[PDB]
Symmetry: D2
Subunit: 300 residues, 4 copies
């Protein structure tokens, strides 16, 4: 039987994720939302594109969690002062997870809702799922923006640029230029220190840069691509090495917390958390980031 992917929240990120996934013909897709008509319409529209692109994937829209039963992967993209933001997203996340988790006990849950690290922590607590199967998408998106800026500046193919980073988005991000390369060569060999610093800065503010341009909306093409790549990693058991929000039990000196770290991602979800040897400067950035993430967790 085909793999089954359920996407909770048929907004810009959710429907765009469905688009990236359908074209890959990875499995059947279920788009769920609380708003009537929206998920059914977007699903049917995407589905009607199948004869043109040539993919045989069933794309259905629904308002009933019963249709997400026995999903292999669950993608949560239903999220919406700072304390109010947390409360609002916590209620939505709790509601989404408590109704979906029980119907797909063997599924891997991929959270996209912000505040990312906190919501992923909540999703694990509410689902009761083994920690390795509840992860958050954040690092892959930030790393993609970073890689795009590098390829653009260096004048090289985006396929030959790799990068690893940690933490969350914005101020919570932990950039690691030392761990970025172009075909195995340090990026510091292609880009001067000052320009590289500008690129790191642009990466931290990357999400806001899109917001300031759209005025009334946030990014969705890259966030969905990032989310889709993680879904593919699990379904095809590719063992991708990427930065994802995972539950830590001592790594980097952090415990009882979800934090963006390097992992091997496969069919079993987080199969391994890599512990990189960070220098003094890098640890300073990680500690500052960990602090902010911890604060958000405490508020939650």
């Amino acid at each position: 039987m085909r793999k089954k992917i359920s996407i909770i929240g048929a907004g810009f990120v959710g429907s765009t994720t469905a688009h990236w996934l359908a074209a890959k013909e990875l499995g059947d897709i279920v788009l769920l939302d609380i708003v009537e008509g929206v998920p059914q319409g977007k699903a049917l529209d995407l589905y009607e594109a199948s004869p043109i692109e040539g993919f045989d994937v069933r794309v259905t829209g629904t308002n009933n969690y019963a249709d997400t039963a026995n999903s292999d992967v669950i993608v949560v993209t239903s999220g919406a002062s700072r304390e109010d933001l947390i409360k609002v997203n916590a209620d939505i996340t709790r509601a989404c997870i408590s109704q979906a988790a029980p119907l797909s006990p063997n599924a891997v849950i991929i959270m996209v809702n912000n505040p990312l690290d906190a919501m992923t922590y909540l999703a694990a607590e509410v689902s009761g799922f083994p920690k390795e199967r509840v992860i958050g998408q954040a690092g892959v998106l930030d790393a993609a923006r970073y890689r795009t800026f590098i390829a653009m500046e260096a004048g090289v193919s985006v396929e030959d640029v790799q990068a690893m980073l940690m933490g969350g988005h914005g101020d919570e991000m932990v950039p690691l230029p030392r761990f970025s390369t172009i075909s195995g060569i340090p990026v510091s060999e292609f880009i001067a220190p000052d320009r590289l610093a500008q690129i790191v800065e642009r990466t931290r503010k990357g999400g806001g840069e899109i917001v300031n341009l759209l005025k009334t909306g946030s990014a969705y093409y890259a966030p969905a691509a990032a989310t889709a790549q993680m879904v593919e990693a699990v379904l095809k058991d590719k063992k991708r090495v990427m930065p994802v929000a995972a539950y830590l039990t001592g790594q980097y000196g952090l415990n009882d917390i979800y934090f963006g770290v390097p992992v091997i991602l496969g069919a079993g979800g987080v199969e391994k958390i890599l512990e990189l040897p960070l220098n003094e400067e890098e640890m300073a950035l990680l500690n500052a980031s960990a602090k902010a993430v911890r604060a958000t967790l405490d508020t939650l």
Copy 2:
């Protein structure tokens, strides 16, 4: 030098078309709109997804027609009572074409704006381009919905279903079940007459079906996929046989009019208009459709 694709109108259809195209790595894409920030933001967002998907295509947003200079293909997706609709879209189309056409004299123009046939006619008149290089996208979308419904009903792969039709959307559509097959076998062998009639009806109202579900918006995934397939046909010179709005000079007894007909589409745009031998019933449908299209043209 890479091929260059300019998309006029960075709304739902325009930006989604860019998405389908970027993933195919067909050429550099320019997204233009009159609204500041929107095209730049959507382009940058899509562009930042490139390292994840692995495509090396430059995706830029702009408000200046100067950036669409020397495009190989121009896609127009900037369109918005019935007489007022025509007037409104005619002004937009005229404005878009008069500013873009002169900067890309060798380009093929693919119109998507409604009323499709009329706007394509206007685009040809305003551009002064040879008629074979100014076509409209309509038939491929309707045929895709038709094919999707058949594959779904028959229980077969969407890759083995083919269909040809004529006319425009809705009431102007000319369904041709006789010219639809599953791996060379007439669909009438898989689906009873009554169910087939229902499918034809659903196809005629296919666009409205999405509208009634979204409430505040029309379809874009399939329309963009249909538009992208036509762009690919031209750039790769694939000689696709598909229904597109083309300028007729006697075919089917029609003259001085853009109408949805079967054509061979390649690098030179419309390389041949096929003349199918229609039976009495089919001709009745074509004449009724031609009449409505002519009326719209007269109003214009």
Copy 3:
């Protein structure tokens, strides 16, 4: 756990089938052969291409059947006339089938129809899970000649046909279209007749050119597409060698017929409304196929 595909026979068709399959990243591939070194070498070579093309699939070569255990699909391309191939086929299936009880077997060896029938008898598998590849290849050649003649995209040409290869083939120009439009609308009767004849002799044409070898690119592509249909349950409508129980008036025999191919193997055998002319061709073909069976 990824899907598992075992290919018995690491020659031209088998290794090329591994190539088409690997690029699609459909599952892990096992290449088996009786010649030592050959499968290990070809598998490793294809495996080393993975970082360049970006596919994550294990390609392993072996001489041990134990490695093909729990395969989802078994492709047999090890044939070398009816005696030689029958012994080879019986040897391959008897050792493989027991280790993968839930697999779908796709036969490619010639004589195709008879060997598929044999594989079904030897494996004890339900008839719907033992099929042969033949029609997809012939149709592919036919579609190529049509596209070339009409000057249209190969993606817009479809065709159905029945029977076996060459003289046993049952052409059906009537059941071939370009974007739903009859091919008769693009190509005149005499030219169409020459294309059908070239289709009948398609295999021989390649042999006459290569001299020492037989075709493998198209045959392998045809086989891979069938494998994909099964693994993704795409329900492709294609001509394949299937076990008939009355369809077309034929019983107890494997014959090339149109089917809906999915995860359950042959999920449905289509019954085309053949006219008298087309029915005569089928009867003659069926007779030749039955002869091979009786000899078997």
Copy 4:
């Protein structure tokens, strides 16, 4: 008008390169060879697979150089030691180059570096448009062994290396990473040393297995990726045999170095900060390459 790719030499590497290229639908392909029938047969066979895979590219086989006219890229995979291949290379380039003055030539024949140098001399083409494929293949093997050992996706492993094949290869583990992370973090020193050695002997390993043949799947994939880099101006960063004018302290010679490959061919030669240990290896390798050149 689609791009045009001509492949001189329709053997294992050449025909397989046509396969990888066709599936990508990058342009029309011409397969040329001196043996009659062989290229025509392989081209037709691959062409007949087009309706199945859905690619619209003409694949034509020929024995006439006139058919390779106006190619955007010319791939040379016709080599058969320095005398034999030199005569073959001179024969192929002298007839092809004049008919496609704007083409980028990609050499695959061995000895790679010397033959690329010869092709440059014979064609009169700017040095940036005459390159050889060698490093992409070795790096591919290295990346495969790393992925396999670390147990990670082959898409997340990158590596740079220089020089030629086997003993002339210049490994640079220091310049290899997994998602930007040094491979040294995943694989210990002794195990890494064994992987480098297996990389040096990679070609020979396939030959010892196949017995009568040499590798072709990976070599062809490596060649196709370079062809793609040029046709789409992707600006890939890869090791290729390029003409040096002082870089690394080397002059008047073709040597495997890291370059940015695009439509203009070698658009830039990268100068890596090699330590003393790595510099010694390069000097030794350069010496062996120069020897081949002097003999040439």
